[PDB]
């Protein structure tokens, strides 16, 4: 049909959407956004919306270091671009707040934020995005209390019932979470009797079960619990992920290098395995393959605090007591703006 | 990095001054709480113009981003508040430590 006839944008934008959806494609998706905006004034702010969403989607991919810094700001310029361009639209205020709150830099997001509510404040995304960015300045009370009222306005989402599960583990106590699970675990059950959808809701709830319980010091109802949880995926990364951690915490320190190596041989890209891998090989003495997998990390990903510490942690022990001082300190700035949860959990969809 | 805090004087023309910039589409609020009493919402200001009461006369400095009050026995408590209220809603950003004052 673009072919037919190129006069009119809504089908190469209908078009971009549906390669920007499920089907989860790119290249076409970037064709067709330049297509829309190489030729009113609406039509082209969106087509800059979708070609910046576009930009975050491949960083969000991407493998090395620069291209990730040079796809955030190319996307950085196009939602300003289409903010300019029209200021009269919430979901763009909220997009652009959303993706400067990756680059770190809180009160300029957070003023976008809260322009973008004074637009509008029903959005459930907008009031998620705020307690989550309130959960970064270490304000835990204001973000529990904003996250309350939305579950009080959406009774029956999840992400937020995460959330909150996670904001109270952190701040409340165990026993709260545990209530909160049992009703999660209730409301599923109500609401429900082909997708997979909910096996993985069903599998998120015993993992977070397994944890809250893994807080406190009872390996065997942990253990239990990431047992039954195995049933259903045998096989997933997460599972042997728990089941090295309570090997860990059970004491004896060589099954759990085991379960790490198999949960890293199934997801090269998981973080936290490869970390408690490392912390375990540090204090057995080999000094040789730890750096090499600290810097397979840092490569992958420069946003934790925790590999940046144990590097310095490691190095301090090789002789340069200013590079250790030098990741120290990188830590402890990296620290003071960490969230609960990472942004990204937020989907971004047109 | 600069921590914003808030010192008020007077008690015993009651002045509150923060050392940051604030901005004035904060709102900023005098709150009372008395010996056996609960915490009520006594005065508040907003950057445009528009004071909300409950006698007492104040004004916003913006230069050195002051509060003064002029007047004609409890703790008062300057705050700084958004609002952010389709549905009435309040949000306490900034609460001070307050000063007691004593009425004969």
């Known amino acids: 049909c673009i072919r037919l006839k190129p006069d009119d944008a809504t089908i190469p934008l209908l078009a971009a959407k549906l390669c920007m959806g499920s089907l989860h494609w790119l290249e076409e998706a970037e064709k067709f956004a330049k297509t829309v905006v190489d030729v009113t004034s609406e039509f082209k702010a969106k087509g800059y919306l979708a070609l910046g969403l576009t930009y975050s989607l491949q960083a969000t991919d991407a493998s090395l270091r620069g291209m990730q810094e040079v796809l955030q700001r190319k996307a950085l310029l196009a939602f300003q671009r289409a903010h300019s361009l029209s200021p009269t639209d919430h979901q763009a205020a909220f997009y652009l707040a959303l993706q400067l709150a990756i680059s770190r830099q809180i009160p300029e997001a957070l003023g976008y934020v809260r322009q973008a509510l004074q637009l509008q404040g029903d959005d459930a995304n907008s009031l998620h995005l705020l307690a989550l960015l309130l959960s970064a300045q270490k304000h835990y009370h204001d973000a529990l209390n904003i996250i309350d009222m939305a579950l009080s306005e959406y009774p029956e989402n999840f992400i937020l019932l995460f959330s909150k599960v996670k904001l109270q583990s952190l701040c409340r106590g165990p026993d709260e979470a545990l209530l909160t699970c049992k009703h999660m675990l209730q409301i599923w059950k109500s609401c429900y009797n082909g997708p997979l959808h909910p096996w993985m809701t069903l599998a998120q709830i015993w993992l977070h079960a397994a944890e809250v319980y893994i807080g406190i010091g009872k390996p065997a109802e942990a253990t239990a619990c990431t047992q039954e949880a195995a049933n259903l995926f045998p096989m997933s990364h997460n599972v042997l992920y728990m089941r090295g951690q309570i090997a860990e915490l059970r004491g004896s320190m060589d099954e759990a290098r085991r379960w790490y190596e198999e949960a890293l041989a199934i997801s090269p890209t998981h973080v936290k395995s490869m970390q408690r891998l490392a912390l375990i090989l540090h204090q057995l003495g080999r000094y040789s393959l730890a750096e090499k997998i600290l810097r397979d990390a840092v490569q992958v990903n420069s946003t934790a605090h925790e590999v940046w510490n144990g590097l310095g942690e490691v190095l301090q022990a090789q002789g340069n007591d200013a590079a250790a001082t030098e990741c120290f300190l990188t830590a402890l700035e990296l620290e003071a703006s960490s969230p609960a949860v990472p942004f990204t959990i937020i989907p971004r969809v047109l | 990095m600069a921590q914003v805090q808030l010192q008020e004087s007077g008690g015993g023309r009651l002045s509150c001054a923060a050392s940051?910039?604030?901005?004035?589409?904060?709102?900023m609020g005098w709150y009372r709480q008395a010996p056996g009493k609960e915490r009520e919402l006594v005065a508040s200001?907003?950057?445009?113009?528009?004071?909300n009461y409950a006698r007492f006369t104040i004004s916003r400095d913006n230069a050195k981003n002051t509060v003064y009050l002029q007047m004609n026995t409890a703790v008062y408590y300057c705050?700084?508040?958004?609002?952010?209220?389709?549905?009435?809603?309040?949000?306490?950003?900034?609460w001070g430590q307050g000063t007691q004052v004593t009425v004969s």
């Open positions: 705050a700084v508040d958004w609002i952010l209220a389709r549905y009435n809603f309040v949000i306490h950003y900034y």
């Open positions: 940051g910039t604030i901005s004035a589409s904060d709102y």
């Open positions: 200001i907003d950057g445009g113009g528009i004071t």
